Write an enzyme that holds these catalytic residues in place. Structure first.
Site, PDB file in Angstrom:
ATOM      1  N   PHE A 269       2.844   9.105  12.494  1.00  0.00           N
ATOM      2  CA  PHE A 269       2.770   8.859  11.057  1.00  0.00           C
ATOM      3  C   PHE A 269       2.784  10.199  10.329  1.00  0.00           C
ATOM      4  CE2 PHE A 269       1.949   4.555  12.155  1.00  0.00           C
ATOM      5  CZ  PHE A 269       2.140   3.774  11.029  1.00  0.00           C
TER       6      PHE A 269
ATOM      7  N   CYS B 297       2.113  10.543  -4.991  1.00  0.00           N
ATOM      8  CA  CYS B 297       2.706   9.245  -5.267  1.00  0.00           C
ATOM      9  C   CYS B 297       3.145   9.192  -6.720  1.00  0.00           C
ATOM     10  CB  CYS B 297       1.714   8.116  -5.004  1.00  0.00           C
ATOM     11  SG  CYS B 297       2.510   6.503  -5.237  1.00  0.00           S
TER      12      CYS B 297
ATOM     13  N   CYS C 108       0.034   1.386  -9.783  1.00  0.00           N
ATOM     14  CA  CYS C 108      -0.439   0.787  -8.544  1.00  0.00           C
ATOM     15  C   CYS C 108      -1.951   1.050  -8.440  1.00  0.00           C
ATOM     16  CB  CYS C 108       0.318   1.376  -7.296  1.00  0.00           C
ATOM     17  SG  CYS C 108      -0.280   0.715  -5.706  1.00  0.00           S
TER      18      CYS C 108
ATOM     19  N   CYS D  16      -4.587   0.888  -4.077  1.00  0.00           N
ATOM     20  CA  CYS D  16      -4.261   1.709  -2.900  1.00  0.00           C
ATOM     21  C   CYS D  16      -5.504   1.998  -2.020  1.00  0.00           C
ATOM     22  CB  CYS D  16      -3.626   3.022  -3.338  1.00  0.00           C
ATOM     23  SG  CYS D  16      -3.021   4.058  -1.959  1.00  0.00           S
ATOM     24  N   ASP D  17      -5.302   1.890  -0.699  1.00  0.00           N
ATOM     25  CA  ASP D  17      -6.342   2.088   0.331  1.00  0.00           C
ATOM     26  C   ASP D  17      -6.305   3.501   0.926  1.00  0.00           C
ATOM     27  OD1 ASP D  17      -4.133   2.033   2.051  1.00  0.00           O
ATOM     28  OD2 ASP D  17      -4.691   0.279   3.303  1.00  0.00           O
ATOM     29  N   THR D  18      -5.469   4.375   0.383  1.00  0.00           N
ATOM     30  CA  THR D  18      -5.124   5.599   1.090  1.00  0.00           C
ATOM     31  C   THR D  18      -5.466   6.877   0.325  1.00  0.00           C
ATOM     32  OG1 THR D  18      -3.353   4.526   2.406  1.00  0.00           O
ATOM     33  CG2 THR D  18      -3.120   6.895   2.075  1.00  0.00           C
TER      34      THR D  18
ATOM     35  N   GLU E 278       7.744   3.749   4.824  1.00  0.00           N
ATOM     36  CA  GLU E 278       6.924   2.824   4.087  1.00  0.00           C
ATOM     37  C   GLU E 278       7.111   3.223   2.633  1.00  0.00           C
ATOM     38  OE1 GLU E 278       5.133   0.781   7.370  1.00  0.00           O
ATOM     39  OE2 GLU E 278       4.454   0.533   5.281  1.00  0.00           O
TER      40      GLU E 278
ATOM     41  N   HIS F  49      -4.517  -2.220  12.472  1.00  0.00           N
ATOM     42  CA  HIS F  49      -5.227  -0.985  12.860  1.00  0.00           C
ATOM     43  C   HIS F  49      -6.687  -0.975  12.338  1.00  0.00           C
ATOM     44  CE1 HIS F  49      -3.311  -0.337   8.933  1.00  0.00           C
ATOM     45  NE2 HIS F  49      -4.148   0.669   8.690  1.00  0.00           N
TER      46      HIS F  49
END
Ligand SMILES: C[S@@+](CC[C@H](N)C(=O)[O-])C[C@H]1O[C@@H](n2cnc3c(N)ncnc32)[C@H](O)[C@@H]1O
Ligand SMILES: C[S@@+](CC[C@H](N)C(=O)[O-])C[C@H]1O[C@@H](n2cnc3c(N)ncnc32)[C@H](O)[C@@H]1O
Ligand SMILES: Nc1nc2[nH]cc(C(=O)O)c2c(=O)[nH]1
Ligand SMILES: Nc1nc2[nH]cc(C(=O)O)c2c(=O)[nH]1
Ligand code: SF4
Ligand code: SF4
Ligand SMILES: [Mg+2]
Ligand SMILES: [Mg+2]
Ligand code: NA
Lengths: 209, 209
Positions: A24, A30, A45, A48-50, A115, A203
């Site tokens: 990855f 972003c 957005c 987001c989890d990131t 992605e 995951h």
């Protein structure tokens, strides 16, 4: 030049390639959110989890050129093993992923996945294109390998996404304090509308990166 | 005539089709275990997670002919929806799955998958062949779509399996008292040998049939 948050070796947790070993490469930055919490509620957005801010994660940094980045990516693959596979993500990877990096990854024997939020044009030499449309952003990428829609989102025309030109149509439950609820919604959606299939974030259940 | 333990509509939890809506048709009876707990300790296949004895499950029964069985399978599909897909399992489906049933499922618009232990010949007109070899049984099916190996089993020759003629090579952790251990072993196997990808039993994490 590339700004990379982190690079790590794990299994792809999501989509049709779930379970597959992959490097990855998480690009920093972003176009639909700044990555700052004080901005989240007003962002395009918002779910987001990131963490994609900065270049301070594992193997993260500013890479001089494509060869340096490819070297670090290749370095994480088991020696003497093929099936090389890299998932370019972020952040929004199309802000930075360019033809020279795609060509150098291919020359190094990698298959390339992306992605992407679908708001920017993609390089069609990418091998696996995963588009995850954000309901309040434009969707300019309307063909690809898998359309992986996070649900629920307000303003979504979910059934219509199925008219786009993808091989797979997936719903992925939104993680956050309603994940179990969203997972039940997603399973039900697929069972009622079986063009669609479920993408779990496996995951997170396996507790792996 | 078909002896069917149960037929139910859910998402495929396993293998490369994980997440996909499917009618499961679970045939009664297996050639590698009687299904009797008293016999488990001495059986060829000893780790089975499934009840495949009798015809007393949901929609289970003795079906007079293929048309009867297809009728019940079709009736579980959402009205007006296509993408019909049936997973024939058990038990060992190849004890009973025959060309007439394959022909009638196909006539009713179903794509057909099988879950088979590989010790018996399979029909090549089946659309999706998933073989899950048991270490102490013959393996006569050496080609198919996915080879989904439950690990660990004693006597297993895991790298040899990757020489066979399959599109996908998967390891699935053995459920039982050591599932978490086995899951870590399986993740590690794939990361070291990335021809292999992980098959989680996602329905057990989702808590769905
Ligand atoms: C973090 S994004 C990065 C790539 C690009 N920004 C995109 O949105 O596809 C990778 C995947 O995680 C998904 N994702 C982000 N936040 C999520 C959440 N809270 N729950 C579930 N999936 C989420 C995104 O939709 C995308 O499919
Ligand atoms: C119940 S079996 C029936 C189909 C066929 N008899 C077979 O063995 O493939 C369906 C799937 O469950 C898998 N399975 C059975 N017991 C399991 C367990 N304890 N943990 C993980 N997978 C298991 C089998 O290997 C197979 O892939
Ligand atoms: N294992 C794993 N699979 C993933 N698939 C997409 C991810 C992403 O952050 O883009 C992701 C991630 O962060 N981890
Ligand atoms: N959801 C779900 N997926 C499955 N895939 C294979 C199964 C089987 O019992 O053969 C199974 C099962 O029992 N449930
Ligand atoms: S578009 Fe992708 S990276 Fe950007 S905030 Fe949304 S999920 Fe996160
Ligand atoms: S061969 Fe398949 S159905 Fe038979 S006992 Fe083993 S896992 Fe269960
Ligand atoms: Mg992530
Ligand atoms: Mg089962
Ligand atoms: Na909505």
């Amino acid at each position: 030049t590339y700004a990379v948050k982190e690079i790590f070796y794990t299994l792809q947790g999501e989509g049709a390639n779930a379970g597959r070993p992959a490097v990855f490469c998480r690009f920093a930055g972003c176009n639909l959110w700044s990555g700052r919490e004080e901005d989240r509620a007003q962002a395009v957005c918002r779910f987001c989890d990131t963490d994609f801010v900065g270049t301070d994660g594992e193997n993260g940094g500013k890479f001089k050129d494509a060869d340096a980045l490819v070297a670090t990516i290749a370095g994480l693959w088991p020696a003497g093993e093929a099936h090389r596979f890299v998932v370019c993500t972020g952040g929004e990877p199309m802000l930075q992923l360019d033809q020279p990096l795609v060509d150098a990854l291919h020359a190094a024997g990698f298959g390339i996945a992306i992605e992407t939020n679908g708001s920017l044009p993609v390089l069609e030499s990418i091998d696996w294109i995963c588009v995850s449309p954000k309901a309040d952003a434009p969707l300019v990428v309307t063909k690809g390998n898998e359309l992986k829609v996070v649900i629920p989102q307000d303003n979504q025309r979910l059934a219509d996404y199925a008219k786009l030109d993808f091989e797979y149509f997936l719903v992925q439950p939104m993680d956050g304090p309603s994940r179990d609820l969203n997972t039940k919604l997603a399973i039900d959606w697929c069972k009622r509308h079986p063009q669609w299939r479920l993408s779990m974030q496996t995951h997170k259940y396996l507790n792996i990166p």
